[PDB]
Design an enzyme around this catalytic site. Structure first.
Site, PDB file in Angstrom:
ATOM      1  N   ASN A  44       0.780  -1.477   0.099  1.00  0.00           N
ATOM      2  CA  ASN A  44      -0.002  -0.047   0.004  1.00  0.00           C
ATOM      3  C   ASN A  44       0.886   1.173   0.071  1.00  0.00           C
ATOM      4  OD1 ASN A  44      -2.407   1.187   2.530  1.00  0.00           O
ATOM      5  ND2 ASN A  44      -2.741   1.379   0.207  1.00  0.00           N
ATOM      6  N   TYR A  77      -7.915  13.997  -2.428  1.00  0.00           N
ATOM      7  CA  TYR A  77      -7.505  13.100  -1.167  1.00  0.00           C
ATOM      8  C   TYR A  77      -6.883  14.043  -0.109  1.00  0.00           C
ATOM      9  CZ  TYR A  77      -4.838   9.920   1.666  1.00  0.00           C
ATOM     10  OH  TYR A  77      -4.508   9.532   3.259  1.00  0.00           O
ATOM     11  N   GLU A  86     -10.225  11.443   7.176  1.00  0.00           N
ATOM     12  CA  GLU A  86      -9.658  11.043   5.813  1.00  0.00           C
ATOM     13  C   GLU A  86     -10.726  11.032   4.821  1.00  0.00           C
ATOM     14  OE1 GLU A  86      -7.850   7.119   5.312  1.00  0.00           O
ATOM     15  OE2 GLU A  86      -6.162   8.110   4.413  1.00  0.00           O
ATOM     16  N   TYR A  88     -12.104  11.240   0.364  1.00  0.00           N
ATOM     17  CA  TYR A  88     -11.778  11.020  -1.096  1.00  0.00           C
ATOM     18  C   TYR A  88     -12.779  11.336  -1.812  1.00  0.00           C
ATOM     19  CZ  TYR A  88      -8.475   7.033   0.661  1.00  0.00           C
ATOM     20  OH  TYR A  88      -7.557   6.101   1.078  1.00  0.00           O
ATOM     21  N   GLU A 177      -3.232   6.201  -5.228  1.00  0.00           N
ATOM     22  CA  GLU A 177      -3.170   5.013  -4.161  1.00  0.00           C
ATOM     23  C   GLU A 177      -3.020   3.726  -4.772  1.00  0.00           C
ATOM     24  OE1 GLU A 177      -5.604   5.515  -0.804  1.00  0.00           O
ATOM     25  OE2 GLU A 177      -4.926   3.646   0.127  1.00  0.00           O
TER      26      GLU A 177
HETATM   27  N1  LIG Z   1      -5.205   5.434   2.559  1.00  0.00           N
HETATM   28  C1  LIG Z   1      -4.114   5.180   3.358  1.00  0.00           C
HETATM   29  N2  LIG Z   1      -3.418   4.266   3.080  1.00  0.00           N
HETATM   30  N3  LIG Z   1      -3.684   6.053   4.161  1.00  0.00           N
HETATM   31  C2  LIG Z   1      -2.369   6.169   4.973  1.00  0.00           C
HETATM   32  C3  LIG Z   1      -2.459   7.506   6.162  1.00  0.00           C
HETATM   33  C4  LIG Z   1      -1.120   7.336   6.353  1.00  0.00           C
HETATM   34  C5  LIG Z   1      -0.918   8.433   7.491  1.00  0.00           C
HETATM   35  N4  LIG Z   1      -1.417   9.694   7.516  1.00  0.00           N
HETATM   36  C6  LIG Z   1       0.629   8.446   8.294  1.00  0.00           C
HETATM   37  O1  LIG Z   1       1.555   9.447   8.036  1.00  0.00           O
HETATM   38  O2  LIG Z   1       1.035   7.476   8.885  1.00  0.00           O
HETATM   39 NA    NA Z   2      -6.313   8.166  -4.464  1.00  0.00          NA
HETATM   40 NA    NA Z   3      -5.390   8.113  -1.843  1.00  0.00          NA
END
Ligand SMILES: NC(=[NH2+])NCCC[C@H](N)C(=O)O
Ligand code: NA
Ligand code: NA
Ligand code: NA
Ligand code: NA
Ligand code: NA
Length: 190
Positions: A44, A77, A86, A88, A177
């Protein structure tokens, strides 16, 4: 240039590039609002360019080439604080609709398509403030595209009619992503 994970500013735009520690991702910042991501058998990751902080009425322009081979999204995003959210606005995706399993709350029509609206919950997961529990807000475009403009206020207004309220904005980007997939993308934001 090609960079490791981190955040900062490049050619007038904020950027964020995050990954889960798996290999396979090449993220490159380019001139202006440009970035590129090539991924071969990633875990990811999320990367892209935009603004720190965002606004509740930004009109975001994007264009480029988006070629996912498996699970990936192309989205506006970003995050808020108080409440921690969060969110989207998904313009395109590969093999997996991010709303699968989620309860539909409504629809909004914006920028040439209907979008379906959903809320999900992340429990003890990574966030902009560290490990946390938080909601995610989603608008998922029915007619996929790789260029256009997004009137964010149309989405934020529609989410607020279902009690999906946003706090003080943190970053706001156009992000690619991926999730345990391959692909290539090159995008310019403005
Ligand atoms: N949709 C995702 N994969 N989100 C990841 C978020 C990461 C988070 N903001 C961090 O700095 O650890
Ligand atoms: Na995205
Ligand atoms: Na994203
Ligand atoms: Na997908
Ligand atoms: Na839109
Ligand atoms: Na934001």
């Amino acid at each position: 240039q090609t960079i490791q994970p981190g955040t900062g500013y490049n050619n007038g735009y904020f950027y964020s590039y995050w990954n889960d520690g798996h290999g396979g991702v090449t993220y490159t910042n380019g001139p202006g609002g440009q970035f590129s991501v090539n991924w071969s058998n990633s875990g990811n990751f999320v990367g892209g360019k935009g603004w720190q902080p965002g606004t509740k009425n930004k009109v975001i322009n994007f264009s480029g080439s988006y070629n996912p081979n498996g699970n990936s999204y192309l989205s506006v995003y970003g995050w808020s604080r108080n409440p921690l959210i969060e969110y989207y606005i998904v313009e395109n995706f590969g093999t997996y609709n991010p709303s699968t399993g989620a309860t539909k709350l409504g629809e909004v029509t914006s920028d040439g398509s209907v979008y379906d609206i959903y809320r999900t919950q992340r429990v003890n997961q990574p966030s902009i403030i560290g490990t946390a529990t938080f909601y995610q807000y989603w608008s998922v475009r029915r007619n996929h595209r790789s260029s256009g403009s997004v009137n964010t206020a149309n989405h934020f207004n529609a989410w607020a009619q279902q009690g999906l309220t946003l706090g003080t904005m943190d970053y706001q980007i156009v992000a690619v992503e991926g999730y345990f997939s391959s692909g290539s993308a090159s995008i310019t934001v403005s």
